């Protein structure tokens, strides 16, 4: 059920991306971005935890990212290294987690 | 760091094996166990919540498997079949998770 979209796809490079978050799971403990299609803790972006209410950066982390307790990702002053695909874990209690991957352009 | 190896890595068909896991990082939520080189919500094995010490079992399970409070995984009764990766993912509590893929063979 769980899928992410764009808000603009095509971004100007210049000005921020809105990637949302859509049917969410219940029962989460935190989140976890990932720069690429599949999951990489060494291409991980953030990680969230609800509970503490307080994200933790990645290796690829580029201080352009602002996390929404919904699990959105904001990308401020895209950059055309900024492209491509992003992969979202959500990680539920009993440790079965659910993964989503969107992808934007940018010119 | 977290790193895994199996033991032993050639394995006897219908012996058992056992994925060691050590370099495990401190502050952790659970652990999740995958079938193939990748973190995939489908061929999950086990999901262990180590505060709720409760075990769920995924869609990749086939009742072989056991996991360990020491996030090391021990699988009896092994086909030929099974040769190939099997993906450990250590959720951490600040949600920068770490994964270790183990490899093991049948002859």
Redesign the interface.
Known sequence: QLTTESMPFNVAEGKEVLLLVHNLPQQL????WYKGE????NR?IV???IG?Q???P?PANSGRETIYPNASLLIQNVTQNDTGFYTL?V?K???????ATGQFHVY
Request: glycine share 16%; charged share 20%; no cysteine.
């Open positions: 403990f935190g989140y976890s599949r999951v990489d803790g991980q990680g969230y935890a503490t307080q994200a933790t990645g874990q990680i209690s009993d440790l079965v987690n659910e993964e």
